[PDB]
């Protein structure tokens, strides 16, 4: 199971945090909560997280942080350092607007690259116990 108030999906537990934070601050928080920024690596995981965004009024622009980051020019999941396999980029993304969009978030319920110190809400994930 999951702690109270978290959303179970299979062997994962998710939670939406509304407080606005940089990617790094959001990560540290999720780590404090015993987990990581959410890493939707499957279609079904992404559906669950998008539904959480809708639930929390964050289905528009500047939606919540996810655990992907661009490191050395390539995108990776920050928990493992693994490259992406499954991708859910929105149209024309990642567009590197401004040349410094190095963190992953939801923008209109699709993946987008955004500057890492934009202050967005965030999704955490932890293993079910
Ligand atoms: Ca972008």
93 annotated as ligand-binding: yes
Q: For residue 52, give the CATH number of its domain.
A: 3.10.100.10
Distance 129 CA to ligand 1 centre (A): 36
**How many angstroms does the Cα of residue 103 sit away from the middle of ligand 1?**
9
Structure tokens at 99: 């040349």
In 3D, which of 59, 50, 57 has the Cα closest to residue 18?
A: 57
| Cβ count within 10 A of residue 50 | 18
Is 113 marked as a binding-site residue? Answer: yes
Q: How far does the centroid of ligand 1 lie from the alpha carbon of residue 94, in Å?
A: 5
Whether residue 117 contacts residue 62, with contact meaning beta carbons closer than 8 Å, is answered with: no
Distances from the Cα of 96 to the Cα of 73, 92, 100, 126, angstroms: 11, 10, 6, 29
Containing H/E element for 120? strand 120-127
The 3-state DSSP class for residue 26 equals helix
Domain extent at residue 3: 1-129
Q: What is the resolution of this structure in A?
A: 1.3
Cα 37 from Cα 45, distance rounded (Å) = 13
Q: How many domains does the chain have?
A: 1
End-to-end alpha carbon distance in the chain: 5
Check if the beta carbon of residue 6 is closer than 8 Å to that of residue 129. Answer: no
Distance between Cα 14 and ligand 1 center (Å): 24
Q: How far apart are CA 126 and CA 93, in angstroms?
A: 27
Cα angle at 82 between 76 and 85, to 5 degrees? 80
Which residue numbers come right before each break in the chain (C to N over 2.5 Å)? none
């Amino acid at each position: 199971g999951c702690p109270d108030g978290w959303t179970q999906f299979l062997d994962l537990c998710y939670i939406y945090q509304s407080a606005k934070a940089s990617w790094a601050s959001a990560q540290s928080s999720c780590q404090a909560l015993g987990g990581i920024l959410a890493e939707p690596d499957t279609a079904c995981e992404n559906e669950v997280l998008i539904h959480m965004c809708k639930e929390n009024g964050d289905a528009g622009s500047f939606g919540p942080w996810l655990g992907g980051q661009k490191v050395g020019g390539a995108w990776q999941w920050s928990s493992s350092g693994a490259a992406f396999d499954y991708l859910r980029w929105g149209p024309n993304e990642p567009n590197n607007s401004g040349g410094n969009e190095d963190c992953l978030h939801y923008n209109w319920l699709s993946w987008n690259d955004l500057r890492c110190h934009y202050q967005a809400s965030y999704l955490c994930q932890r293993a079910a116990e």
